[PDB]
């Protein structure tokens, strides 16, 4: 698919702007290995840790929590700690009314309960892991009940297919996504999608589609009251890597929401001023299915119905690939 961009630019120097300054933009869409590496696949399990080695990778899953713990590629570690599912964001200033229902319902901090875990090996040296899980906090009925299928192939890709239902008497969730933690030194972000700045389901009129390259410190927008920031709606693919280009690549079936920061969501929630934010050495990457928009609910109407995350049965379909970006 091809993309045409038409930008309305002026021609003379105004007292406030120069010659080639842009007033508006409009975009338009235009329609237009042979059984050699399956023998290096080895699998073992000790103390619930499923280790899968291949030709040039090594991946360690925790079977009793249903999450990957270590991802390697040519010996390089690519995760710093255990992955999780996340349903909490730092509340915005347009979320002053819905935050009382979120905190009263106990969505402030939830944990994960694994009912059953089971792994196999398909007849092409491919590994499948089936997990039945539930998200719950410590007083109430569980929020999300679902099941996930992790899949490791002969090249080292990690595919996730989670089907989840959510409880019927719950207002609407802030997000639903997979949170990973990549080690120290991951500093470049390169993504194909809408940019070069933040965009949401309802605040997306100023961004345009393209291929952008920036740093993790430039993803962040330092507000006076610290809150949720830096998320890019409708991302097609994204790579988070070091300055030499050793990292991970994320794709999906339909375009997802993408975030990369040096701050976790609880750090942005607990902080009240700009100097209270302590910068972490790691890089928190989040891959959201959907995410509820901003709105203007500080004073006036609430968030609109197509802009909320009011959906109680969904599929996710994420794909993670280790990559050395300079030679792929």
């Amino acid at each position: 698919p091809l993309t045409l961009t038409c930008s309305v630019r002026q021609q003379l120097d105004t007292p406030w702007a120069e010659e080639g300054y842009e007033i508006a933009f409009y975009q338009f869409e235009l329609p237009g290995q042979s059984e050699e590496y399956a023998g290096f696949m080895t699998i073992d399990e000790q103390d619930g840790m499923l280790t899968v080695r291949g030709f040039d990778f090594e991946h360690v899953f925790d079977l009793k929590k249903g999450m990957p713990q270590q991802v390697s590629k040519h010996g390089v570690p690519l995760l710093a700690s255990l992955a999780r599912f996340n349903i909490w964001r730092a509340p915005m200033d347009n979320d002053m009314n819905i935050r009382k229902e979120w905190e009263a319902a106990g969505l402030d901090h939830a944990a994960m309960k694994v009912y059953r875990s089971h792994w196999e090996q398909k007849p092409d040296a491919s590994v499948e892991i089936h997990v039945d899980f539930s998200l719950a906090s410590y007083i109430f009925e569980p929020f999300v009940r679902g099941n996930a299928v992790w899949t490791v192939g002969v090249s080292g890709e990690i595919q996730l297919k989670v089907h989840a239902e959510v409880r019927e008497n719950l207002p609407f969730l802030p997000r639903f996504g997979l949170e990973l933690t990549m080690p120290k030194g991951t500093e470049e972000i390169e993504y194909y999608g809408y940019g070069p700045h933040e965009s949401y389901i309802d605040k997306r009129a100023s961004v345009r589609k393209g291929k952008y390259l920036l740093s993790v410190d430039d993803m962040f927008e330092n507000y006076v009251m610290p809150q949720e920031t830096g998320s890019r709606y409708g991302t097609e693919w994204a790579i988070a890597s070091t300055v030499q280009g050793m990292g991970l690549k994320f794709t999906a079936a339909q375009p997802f929401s993408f975030q990369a920061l040096h701050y976790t969501a609880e750090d942005l929630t607990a902080a009240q001023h700009t100097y209270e934010l302590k910068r972490r050495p790691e890089t928190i990457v989040t891959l959201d299915y959907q995410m509820s928009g901003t709105g203007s609910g500080s004073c006036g109407p609430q968030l609109a119905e197509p802009y909320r995350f009011t959906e109680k049965s969904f599929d996710f379909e994420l794909t993670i690939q280790p990559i050395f970006k300079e030679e792929e």
């Binding site: 103390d47 944990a111 719950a136 410590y138 569980p142």
Partner: protein, 485 residues
């Protein structure tokens, strides 16, 4: 049956646990039995003291062969049993009100379920393998497993009720080995949502009994006062394990023989005895008869009180007179030991209550230690004995029919333990905020079993009506009405 998750099962409440009986200690003579110190008996060996202990933040990371006989437990910690481990440097203290501090997902408990392993050696004499050997745990928080000499012997569940196991196929003369695994959370945590600090561990006494091959298994004493409180009959229903020649004798509070009898009981039978002019029990004149049973090498001592509790015209009566109960509620709580209560700390509370005009105590939301009731028989207090059940839910486990055997046994194990105490006047079926089909089964079993005491349940064939926090206008509305029976 090693770790098949019986603590999330609800169809496995115990493994190999003996059925419930009354509370007694087999002594060797009537002189030793009047002392009350059970360590002086040659048929009793204590297991309190110093055990080897190891704490785990999860049941996942427990070693799979800690229970074996030839393992090295020297690098482990050393913990004094009985004690709660939240007051000994282990996991942090936690108070919670009527909300569950776990996700409400019955019957499942979180994966990070903390655990503790206990190991203790002991000796055993030569004349002990010729008889039956039992182990008794007076109380363990949540659930526990049990291994003797590296062999699985039992699993049990239920935090405030004793558990007794049979160790005759497992022990030998000389050195032995005992291993216990204790978990913090089981499926019985949903039935124990008390508004109290949440402690864990082996917090009550642990001992070993040596009972011979044909022994008196269960005793239920019944005072049988007449209609005008003028003739007494002691009916002692004795349930044995075979053919026993049993001696029995009864004495007044002054220490004089008033009855004596011999019988030959072959499994289940009574031994009635007559008291011509009885001295009655009440909270301000606590007069107690003494019953001595003798069988083989065993001497059992009981303390009997004659009383009658009734309702006549909507008027509660004890021994014919109309009595107004003036009481407080009481948790077992020590500011340094948690739910481990020594004897003098009970005696101080009873003296301080009795010098402030109090005659009733309600055991709030669980049954207490078996010697608290022994003290309350002597000082004089009316006891309302509640069961260990507080399914504050909120749902409705009370109306779920596959929880019914869990609801019923928490009353069966309580009523069978405390049925020979002269101070208990009312059986209460626990804190109720919901009328359910499982509480009425408890009440029907209790009313069929023991008819000498009244049955209380809050949610509301009822005995009495109960209200939590009325106004002063509300009770004087209730009193003047004619539909109040």
């Amino acid at each position: 049956m090693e770790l098949n998750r019986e603590w999330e099962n609800l169809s496995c409440l115990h493994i190999g646990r003996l059925p419930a009986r009354a509370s007694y200690i087999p002594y060797e003579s009537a002189m030793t039995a009047r002392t009350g110190k059970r360590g002086r008996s040659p048929h009793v060996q204590t297991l309190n003291g110093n055990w080897k202990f190891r704490y785990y933040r999860s049941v996942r990371e427990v070693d799979s062969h800690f229970y074996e006989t030839e393992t090295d437990v020297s690098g482990w910690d050393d913990l004094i049993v009985p004690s709660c481990w939240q007051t000994n440097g282990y996991d942090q203290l936690h108070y919670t009100n009527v909300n569950y501090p776990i996700p409400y997902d019955p019957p499942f408990v979180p994966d990070d379920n903390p655990a503790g392993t206990y190991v203790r050696d002991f000796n055993l004499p030569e004349a002990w393998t010729k008889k039956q050997t039992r182990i008794v745990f007076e109380g363990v928080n949540a659930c526990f497993y049990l291994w003797v000499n590296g062999r699985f012997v039992g699993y049990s569940q239920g935090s405030r009720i004793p558990a007794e196991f049979d160790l005759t196929p497992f022990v030998a003369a000389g050195r032995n080995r005992l291993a216990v695994l204790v978990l913090k959370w089981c499926d019985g945590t949903y039935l124990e949502d008390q508004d109290v600090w949440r402690f864990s561990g082996i917090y009550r006494d642990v001992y070993l009994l040596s009972r011979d091959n044909t022994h008196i298994r269960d005793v239920f004493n019944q005072p049988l006062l007449s209609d005008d409180l003028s003739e007494g009959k002691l009916r002692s229903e004795i349930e044995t394990t075979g053919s026993l020649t049993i001696q029995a004798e009864l004495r007044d509070p002054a220490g004089k023989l008033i009855g004596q009898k011999e019988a030959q009981i072959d499994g289940k039978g009574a031994m009635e005895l007559d008291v011509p002019q009885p001295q009655l029990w009440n909270a301000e004149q606590p007069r107690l008869y003494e019953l001595i049973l003798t069988a083989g090498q065993e001497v059992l001592r009981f303390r009997v009180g004659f009383k009658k509790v009734e309702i006549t015209d909507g008027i509660f009566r004890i021994n014919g007179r109309a009595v107004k109960l003036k009481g407080v509620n009481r948790h077992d709580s020590h500011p340094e030991l948690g739910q481990t209560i020594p004897v003098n700390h009970m005696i101080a509370d009873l003296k301080l209550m009795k010098r402030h005009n109090i005659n009733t105590i309600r055991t709030s939301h669980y049954p207490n230690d078996p010697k608290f009731l022994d003290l309350c028989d002597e000082f004089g207090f009316y006891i309302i004995d509640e069961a260990d059940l507080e399914c504050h839910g909120v749902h409705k486990l009370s109306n779920n029919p596959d929880w019914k055997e869990a609801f019923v046994e928490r009353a069966v194990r309580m009523v069978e333990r405390d049925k020979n105490h002269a101070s208990v006047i009312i059986w209460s079926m626990g804190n109720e905020s919901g009328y359910g089909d499982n509480h009425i089964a408890m009440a029907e079993w209790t009313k069929a079993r023991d008819a000498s005491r009244l049955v209380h349940y809050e949610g509301a064939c009822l005995d009495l009506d109960s209200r939590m926090y009325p106004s002063v206008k509300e009770i004087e509305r209730y009193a003047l009405d004619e539909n109040s029976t």
